[PDB]
Amino acid sequence: GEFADKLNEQKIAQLEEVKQASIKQIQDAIDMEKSQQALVQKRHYLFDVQRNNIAMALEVTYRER
Amino acid sequence: KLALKTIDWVAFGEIIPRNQKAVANSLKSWNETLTSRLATLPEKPPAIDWAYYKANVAKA
Incomplete structure (x- = not known):
């Protein structure tokens, strides 16, 4: 009788870790993708701020002259 | 006229x-x-107003 219960509870326990892993991994495929998307567009802006800053600073300078 | 790469600040943050x-x-x-x-x-x-100054000068 017990033969089943231990095995069964074993068998469930498994798919319980299986569903778990599975969520946790796909959440990670997810994070990775956000990391990427960010490094994409995202990062250029830093340099864009910088280039913009220059452009302005020359204009102000020209005008001031 | 200037070009100025547009910028979303919360991303920059x-x-x-x-x-x-x-x-x-x-x-x-x-x-x-x-x-x-x-x-x-x-x-x-x-x-x-060059005319004006020309109008009130003294050195030629």
Whole structure:
């Protein structure tokens, strides 16, 4: 009788870790993708701020002259 | 007329390492400063009423 219960509870326990892993991994495929998307567009802006800053600073300078 | 690569600031916030937040801050304010500046500093200066001065001089 017990033969089943231990095995069964074993068998469930498994798919319980299986569903778990599975969520946790796909959440990670997810994070990775956000990391990427960010490094994409995202990062250029830093340099864009910088280039913009220059452009302005020359204009102000020209005008001031 | 200037080109000025458009910029979404919350992204800019989200790409700076912490050990670099300092820099990023100063970079932001300069931009803002700079911007305010151009809003007030006109393309060209007022002209110069040359006739008037010509009208009130003494050296030829």
